[PDB]
From a paper:
Intimin is a 94 kDa outer membrane protein, essential for the intimate attachment of bacterial cells to the host cell surface, followed by actin pedestal formation. Intimin is classified as an inverse autotransporter, a subclass of the type 5 secretion system that transports the C-terminal extracellular region or passenger through the lumen of the N-terminal β-barrel located in the outer membrane. The intimin passenger forms a rod-like extension consisting of four tandem bacterial immunoglobulin-like (Big) domains (subdomains D00–D0–D1–D2) capped by a C-terminal C-type lectin-like domain (D3). Here, we describe the crystal structures of the combined intimin domains D00–D0 and D0–D1 from the EPEC strain E2348/69 determined at 1.5 Å and 1.8 Å resolution, respectively.
The structure of D00–D0 has an elongated conformation, spanning 78 Å between the N- and C-termini. The subdomain D00 also exhibits an IgSF fold with a β-sandwich, yet it shows distinct structural differences when compared to the s-type fold seen in subdomains D0 and D1. In addition to the two common β-sheets, β-strands A1 and B2 form a separate small β-sheet due to shortened β-strands D and E. The presence of a third β-sheet in an Ig-fold is not novel as it has been previously described in Ig-domain subtype C425. The β-sandwich of D00 is additionally disrupted in strand C by a short α-helix induced by residue Pro515. A structural similarity search with the D00 structure on PDBeFold revealed similarity to the outermost extracellular domains of several Cadherin types (EC). The D00–D0 connector adopts an S-shaped conformation connecting the D0 and the D00 domains through a hydrogen bond network and solvent-free dry interface. The tight interaction between these two key residues leads to the formation of a classical type I turn in the connector. The asymmetric unit of D00–D0 crystals contained six molecules. The sidechain rotamer of all the implicated residues and thus the hydrogen bond network of the D00–D0 connector region is conserved in all six molecules. OLIGOMER results had a better fit to experimental data (χ2 = 2.45 for merged file) and revealed that the majority of D00–D0 is present in the elongated conformation as shown in the crystal structure.
Numbering used by the authors: 452 to 655
Write the structure that this text describes.
Amino acid sequence: DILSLNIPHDINGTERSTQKIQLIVKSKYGLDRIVWDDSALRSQGGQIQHSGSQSAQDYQAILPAYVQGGSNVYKVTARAYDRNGNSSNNVLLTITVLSNGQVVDQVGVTDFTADKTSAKADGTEAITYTATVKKNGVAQANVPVSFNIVSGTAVLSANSANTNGSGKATVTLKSDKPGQVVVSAKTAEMTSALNANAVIFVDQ
Ligand SMILES: [Br-]
Ligand SMILES: [Br-]
Ligand SMILES: [Cl-]
Ligand SMILES: [Cl-]
Ligand SMILES: [Cl-]
Ligand code: NA
């Protein structure tokens, strides 16, 4: 009744982008300032800063670079103060960082990796690929993933599989010919498939 702060929306954005923060303040005596703990962002070189306008509630987040294999989720807090020195609750804002190649709010393949970098070219040894599907960093269950050989000569065990409860779908690759092979994974919302790193089948 005297002073409240609400943050209606968390932030999901591309690494190194600037993201405006929406604050909703109600203050009987008048807002004086917002005070932030952004130490989680600063651990990776991001920050929360005033947008430079004349408004005491106009802030933005500078997102850090994406950390491969990292959390990429940053929890920061804001507290409003009024002109009498009262404060609001210390309110949580969650900032999730996506890599340059990913799309905010999309159900998309974020990772597509193989268990081996090489295999024998005997048409028998299998390289197993795992695709992870997330939306804003959260794994998505039961999503169909389409698999395709982009280049090279090989055979996929299947052309589509649905993700499990951990957001993962798998397929195997075999080849009778030596050479490099690139396999890709895609979900329906993506604009193009995500290529895995090349693997090589070797004669021996
Ligand atoms: Br809220
Ligand atoms: Br697809
Ligand atoms: Cl509050
Ligand atoms: Cl090998
Ligand atoms: Cl999708
Ligand atoms: Na919120």
